Design a protein around this ligand. Structure first.
Ligand SMILES: [Cl-]
Ligand SMILES: [Cl-]
Length: 90
């Protein structure tokens, strides 16, 4: 279950940091390894959880900035060369 994989791979904490990095405040390689270790069909679910989790170390996050964080997270599979390359986050 994707929820379990997310917890096991360190809550994708390095990806949380990439997501905030590019959301108005070697990490990417650790992010891609954490995410690689999640099964393909669970990567977008788990990046969704990473976005949620990343807002917690963030202060105030307005909804525009939140949407930005999902936009960042949706490019991370493709950046990492991991299927499914993009997440719709519908
Ligand atoms: Cl931002
Ligand atoms: Cl690297």
């Amino acid at each position: 279950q994707c929820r379990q994989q997310f917890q096991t791979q360190q809550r994708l904490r390095a990806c949380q940091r990439v997501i905030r990095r590019w959301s108005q405040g070697p990490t990417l390689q650790r992010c891609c390894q954490q995410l690689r270790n999640i099964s393909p069909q669970c990567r977008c679910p788990s990046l969704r959880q990473a976005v949620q989790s990343a807002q917690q170390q963030q202060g105030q996050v307005g909804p525009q900035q939140v949407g930005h964080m999902y936009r960042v997270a949706s490019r991370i599979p493709a950046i990492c060369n991991l299927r499914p390359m993009s997440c719709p986050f519908r």
